[PDB]
Design a protein around this ligand. Structure first.
Ligand code: ANP
Length: 816
């Protein structure tokens, strides 16, 4: 309700660029939140609508120097495929190689002298005093490769400098330009005084630098493209066309037309042939078949589909042809919001994420400053204290004096110090790891929306389990009926009929369960009238039913918890109070019966706990996370059900009205808490809950409060989600550690600090190391793809042998 927009940005190539984007867009008034993702080439901003419109924000973006636009809905193919830039990097790298090959050849020639040289290594035979032929060929290669290849980098530095920010390639432009100019001036002085010996100059480095930098950019963009495999597949999995037909009377054949997605609308009939795709989600009309959700929910067993079931737009048909009534078309499709969630996931930046953005923003300036300081220190120490340098540079060469070799060494060190920095590595260390973690999670059915839960799941120390829909399957079934009051005027069939018709309006899962049970065990699907209906959350229901004779041919009812009776002046006798205690002791919820103030009997309505709950909870508490069950049912029922799962503390008689006070009660101590809710049923609790994962929200991942979604109703998804977040955040930390230690070792090592020992790297080695690090970080992130979703037996394999027992006595409940 604040006009937030998802914006598409082009030209993003450096992390410092996006840092500039956030910095200034926050600098501009009227913007409260501004985040940009470099990897996905997109930007999302929340802005005040009336004062400023999207035109103004976009225009701010172009005056930055980048081309933006409102993100489209379907078309997002060429933005994420990365094909174009990897192809032009192929082009540039090959254009650099066709000149590096001569550099390779001359380097190998000049390094190793032959055993029996033909003419005593005449390759360096000078022609013009001070200008060796080798130096001249170096000059021509360097000049031509500069002019042609470095055009791209020069233009990038030019456009970057047109504004305040300096991107990554600018420092490479400085490296090459400084090498060029200093080599040129040394050559000019050599040819001016007509020096006998041509000097050694940095014409070797520009083409080697270009070859290795192009190779590194190619490799790292290829790896980045491999990062988006999951999102790319999900995006290019939706069918762009569908078979729409017309039905005469009995779903017969009238006519068929082939239609694209933009034209089809809701309610249309779509035919999918065997082996076909599902282009639109909808309701199954007729035709038994099977479907597979491997690419969507990451499940294994091919899900069966029958007339009246649901479908997913993207599953492959297996048997026969089936007709579907369109219910969600285009953006409505489940895959649409799945991919939307995945792509926005890399928009909610983590604390470490924004720290990395900050550092990378002020990194290239830091690198250039450090390079200049290194140059200054080397030149001054040479010009003043020559004893230290001569301690390891004693070679007396009348051809080249110490005053010149020292300056040359200083320039080499300053070139290699900024040629070894990898701003790209630091910038893309975290975002790519986040992208790969989210992709693997989605491939397993886990939709970890937002990047915040990735790290915020690291610090979780308590998990709040809901009872209905999470611990239980959510399909309660009626066990047995108890009769307490009169029988003559209250025959069993009549009382069940009247109660069922009364609670027909109810939408509580147990209410619908009892409706179906009564209808099936009476055979009378019809029901009477209802008047004066109310539903107090967490207490019960009650209403007035008329037309009782409708089913009797074959009445103010009160149904709810004990609090409803005591509040309504309905005494609960000890005999009945103890009557249901037997049920509650077996972890099965029970509901009493009261009509016109007469407690006729009681009804036992319960659902078996998920068999996997015990293993999942034992693993979760062994992993080092507290577990607590939240429920609104009777305290005895919570006590019994916790036994089947072994929960130390629970919160029973927690009516949905508050349903959150206990969240704060657990939060106030500061320990992080996560809840595993249902979604729409208790969305506010998840919203307040720090890490609220929705369980079983298949085909309805459109949940706002929950920051994590499990497309499949499998409790083990929760433990898998926490464990996957653990490893993904560990990988983010590892990537940051690598991208840092690389820089803090390269800058000294490239600064020649350890040269006295005898380890000094000549310039192009710096570019090689830059490429190596910038690709190694991405490979480390890609390693996350090698994740195997642990299966049932796997968890108890490590948990087997220690299922710590506990009786109801050693179990806690809510206080007050
Ligand atoms: N349809 C109903 N008829 C009679 N009583 C009901 C009905 N629905 C709820 N109640 C009463 O209100 C209480 C609320 O139950 P409920 O809050 O759904 O427990 P839960 O297992 O924690 N499910 P949830 O609210 O999703 O966490 C029930 O225990 C009953 O005592």
């Amino acid at each position: 309700s604040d006009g937030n927009i998802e914006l598409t940005i082009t030209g993003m190539t450096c992390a410092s660029c996006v840092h500039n984007i956030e910095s200034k867009l926050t600098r501009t008034n009227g913007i409260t939140y501004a985040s940009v993702a470099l990897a996905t080439s997109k930007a999302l901003v929340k802005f005040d609508p009336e004062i400023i419109g999207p035109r103004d924000i976009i225009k701010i973006i172009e005056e930055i120097g980048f081309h933006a636009s409102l993100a489209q809905r379907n078309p997002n193919a060429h933005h994420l495929d990365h094909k174009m830039e990897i192809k032009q990097w192929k082009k540039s790298f090959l254009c650099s190689l066709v000149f590096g090959i001569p550099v390779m050849a001359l380097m190998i020639y000049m390094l190793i002298p032959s055993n029996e040289p033909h003419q005593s290594m005449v390759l360096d035979h000078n022609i013009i005093p001070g200008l060796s032929i080798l130096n001249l060929i170096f000059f021509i290669l360097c000049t031509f490769v500069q002019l042609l290849g470095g055009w791209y980098f020069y233009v990038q530095a030019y456009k970057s400098l047109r504004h305040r920010s300096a991107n990554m390639d600018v420092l490479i432009v400085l490296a090459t330009s400084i090498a060029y100019v200093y080599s040129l001036v040394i050559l000019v002085v050599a040819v001016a005084e007509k020096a006998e010996r041509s000097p050694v100059t940095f014409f070797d480095t520009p083409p080697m630098l270009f070859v290795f930098i192009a190779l590194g950019r190619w490799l790292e963009h290829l790896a980045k493209s491999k990062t988006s495999e999951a999102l790319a597949k999900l995006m290019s999995l939706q069918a762009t066309e569908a078979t729409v037909v017309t039905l005469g009377e009995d779903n017969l054949i009238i006519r068929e037309e082939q239609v694209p997605m933009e034209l089809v609308q809701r309610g249309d009939i779509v035919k999918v042939v065997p082996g076909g795709k599902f282009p639109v989600d909808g309701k199954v009309l007729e035709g038994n078949t099977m479907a597979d959700e491997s690419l969507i929910t990451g499940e294994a067993m091919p899900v069966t589909k029958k007339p009246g079931s649901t479908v997913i737009a993207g599953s492959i048909n297996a048997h026969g042809s089936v007709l579907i009534k369109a219910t969600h078309v285009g953006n409505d499709t489940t895959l649409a919001q799945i991919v939307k969630l995945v792509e926005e996931a890399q928009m909610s930046k983590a604390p470490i994420q924004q720290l990395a953005d900050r550092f990378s923003g002020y990194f290239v300036p830091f690198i250039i400053i450090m390079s200049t300081l290194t140059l200054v220190v080397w030149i001054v120490i040479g010009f003043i204290d020559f004893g230290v340098v001569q301690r390891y540079f004693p070679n007396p060469n009348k051809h080249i004096s110490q005053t010149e070799v020292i300056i040359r060494f200083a320039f080499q060190t300053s070139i290699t110090v900024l040629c070894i920095a990898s701003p790209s590595s630091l910038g893309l260390a975290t975002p790519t790891a986040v992208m790969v973690g989210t992709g693997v999670a989605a491939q397993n059915g886990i939709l970890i929306k937002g990047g915040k839960p990735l790290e915020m799941a690291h610090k979780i120390k308590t998990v709040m389990f809901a009872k209905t829909g999470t611990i239980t399957h959510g399909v309660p079934r009626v066990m047995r009926v108890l009769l307490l009051g009169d029988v003559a005027t209250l025959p069993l069939r009549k009382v069940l009929a009247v109660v069922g018709t009364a609670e027909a309006s109810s939408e509580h899962p147990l209410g619908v369960a009892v409706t179906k049970y009564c209808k099936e065990e009476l055979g009378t699907e019809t029901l009477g009238y209802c008047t004066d209906f109310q539903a107090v959350p967490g207490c019960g229901i009650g209403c007035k039913v008329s037309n009782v004779e409708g089913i009797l041919a074959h009445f103010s009812v009160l149904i709810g918890n004990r609090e409803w009776l005591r509040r309504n002046g309905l005494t609960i006798s000890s005999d009945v109070s103890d009557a249901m205690t037997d049920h509650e002791m077996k972890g099965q919820t029970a509901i009493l019966v009261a009509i016109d103030g007469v407690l006729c009997g009681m009804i036992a309505i319960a659902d078996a706990v998920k068999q996997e709950a015990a293993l999942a909870v034992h693993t979760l508490q062994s992993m080092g996370v507290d577990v607590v069950l939240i429920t609104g049912d009777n305290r005895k029922t919570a006590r019994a059900i916790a036994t089947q799962v072994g929960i130390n503390k629970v919160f029973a008689e927690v009516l949905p009205s508050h349903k959150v006070a206990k969240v704060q009660e657990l939060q106030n101590k500061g320990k992080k808490v996560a809840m595993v809710g249902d979604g729409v049923n208790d969305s506010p609790a998840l919203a307040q809950a720090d890490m609220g994962v929705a369980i079983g929200t298949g085909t309805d991942v459109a949940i706002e409060a929950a920051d994590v979604v499990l497309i499949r109703n499998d409790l083990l998804d929760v433990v898998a989600s926490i464990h996957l977040s653990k490893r993904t955040v560990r990988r983010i930390r590892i990537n940051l550690v690598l991208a840092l230690i690389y820089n803090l070792v390269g800058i000294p090592i490239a600064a020649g600090v350890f040269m006295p020992i005898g380890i000094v790297l000549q310039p192009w080695m710096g570019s090689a190391a830059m490429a190596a690090s910038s690709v190694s970080v991405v490979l480390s992130s890609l390693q996350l793809k090698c994740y195997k979703k642990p299966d049932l037996e796997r968890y108890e394999a490590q948990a087997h042998g220690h299922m710590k027992p506990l009786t109801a006595s050693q179990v806690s409940v809510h206080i007050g």
